[model samples]
Target: NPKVLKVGAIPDQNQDVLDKRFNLFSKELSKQLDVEVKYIPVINYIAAVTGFRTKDLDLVWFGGLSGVQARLQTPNSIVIAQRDIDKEFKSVFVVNKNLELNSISNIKGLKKLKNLRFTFGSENSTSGRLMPEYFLNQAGVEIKHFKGKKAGFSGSHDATIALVNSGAFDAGALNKQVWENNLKNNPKRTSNLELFWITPEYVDYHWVAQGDLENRFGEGFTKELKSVILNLDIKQKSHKQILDMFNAKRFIKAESKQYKNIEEIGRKLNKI
Candidate 1:
């Protein structure tokens, strides 16, 4: 194995929070693998994906769309693991309660947002923008087909919630887990927002690593690391915080084929 293992994640939230979470992961991974694990900072989803493409990062946490993008760019990349929650990941569409959009209960109600200003978490986010856009298209409301109003990209899930709750946008979409985590941690911020829709389940975030393990690290080293992550016990105090940081119960082995749906959706959205 190399002297250091570089890891990175997309900037889905505040930098400080990302730094703290990755540092804890690095610590545990280093202890388990007997190598220095370093967390590399990335500014955005594209940055994280690019880091993997350039070989600056050995392992990365990627959302569905970004993971597909990375694997496409570097054909030798492989998905190693994902949180249990990733298998059934869903997105939430939120709207300003003052607009009365929350009163409509069916998926067709989303069509009412055609003329209203809408915002998505990030242009490259799977839950935030891709799946939400797919649902909107299914409801017969293409954001580009809006009469006159323009759509917005809030850049992050937290920002999407803030923009919609603050009435900066009439409606918005993001990862449901981020919304619920915010609800539990900061109810006051979400007071003005209500769920307009919940997207169908799909695969989402997972850990991806360079595929040439035998050449870079050692034969079976990648599988050994995967086992270490998958075996993290929540009952243990050290693992609990790391698990909580991901809002996940535990990690599981991930397969590249799990993201085929994401790849198809990405191509449809022109994100691939």
Candidate 2:
């Protein structure tokens, strides 16, 4: 197929969810292009970013932190589009409801929280790891300080919520949107959770293209891909569904430098 585009996406959620979403996504993209769009499922954010960096993947769906890493590794990769909401992605620190934590401003006051257990979504996760840890450091806490506070990955945002709800940890952080969605879908998941802090806005999760895929696909293919994402003039409900899934308002041209904060945090955490 002339339009058979190989696309890669992180297993941001779980296999069942990934399976269902990709089925819909392929059906949508296949209609526009003779594209045999293959959803290459990556195990984690790092794998997805590394796949893009090595040019092993065609188009990568990357998280904020991994998008930055991809740029550093590949140099030529481009972030063609991100969710309208992604431009302002935020992370939240939530303490167990049993805790007397009244507000996030109390984070600094909890200097005595040296030995509390903490959980993150995934090590490669932007919200789960990079941004949360960055702000945690800013709160004058380090990963090494925690006794039971040793960090852990809950595999998925849903699992993170479940773990916290089960009283497996004292605090944790993940994409606030996912948590909110879970609460809407299953109030029991977040029933024991409370938001302690929220992070400042930054660029995150984006559709990244391989430096050479566009050249091979067609000179105009890259722009076309981006345009499909950014422009909402289309009357097709199929296209609208894909765009809505991505939370896209408009496709904005992006480059590697957007991840300076990503690299900075990666270095601090020894992720690089």
Candidate 3:
């Protein structure tokens, strides 16, 4: 009997884009692993983590906070690969251009965010919430400090950008990659919104696998899978689009220890 590797990722963008990107990844990985690699599309960040916890997913691409949550829930889960860009992922804070919000000169400047209608991507998002809230805490500005606001979750990074662009909120936070993509693909939105701040870089997305992989796929199979990912590059036309889609030069080796900071922040925020 052939083994199956069930993989999933939080649907953070257009379904068509997500499906196309992962389908290519699954196709290449299946050929290399000699197994039926399947893409298990998840509707939200929480569902991605939950799938990992239930062992319904053997492997998953997870954001920092959700990755920490999944690793905590499923003992011995290991981080095996991350995009080169994931090593220093960052977030951006945007405001309606009409607000004339001052540039965030430093983390201390975040205190100015106190009394504004603010929105975040997803409650469980690393770039959207965990890191943004960390900076807000560093600046001593809590959600309660907002003007008649508890803040809002726009569901995804693109939605956060759209809400702020349409003036639904005074300001918002979201993944820098998504923000940049929107600007590149839809430049007109900039007429209404502008980036006001960029959060400090941190470890973000990674491929996490159940610890029992060797028991299922055989000795050295996990290492081989990691190699397959790390070796993928634009040199191969088949790999070019997917690598470009992820905005990564190549995948890199990753390990659980690299995410301790995310775990610490997650616990401090009562998210784990």
Best by lDDT: 1
Instruction: For candidate 1, write residues 83-140 as lDDT tens digits.
Output: 8889999999888889875545666777888878899977899999999898888888
Cα-based RMSD of the predictions, in order? 1.7, 2.6, 1.7
Off by over 4 Å in 3: none
lDDT of each: 0.87, 0.72, 0.86
Cα lDDT of model 2 by residue, 68-131, tens digit: 7777788776778666677678887777888767664644644544577888888878887778
TM per model? 0.95, 0.87, 0.94
Q: Candidate 3: minimum summed lDDT over ten consecutive residues — where?
A: 1-10
Cα displacement (angstroms), candidate 1, residue 81, comes to 1.0
Q: Per-residue lDDT for 63-93 in model 3, tens only?
A: 8888888988899888889987788999999
State which candidate, 1 or 3, has the greater lDDT.
1
Write the candidate numbers in order of decreasing TM-score.
1, 3, 2
Best by TM-score: 1
- Kindly report which residue stretches of model 1 are placed more than 4 angstroms away from their true locations once superposed: 145-149
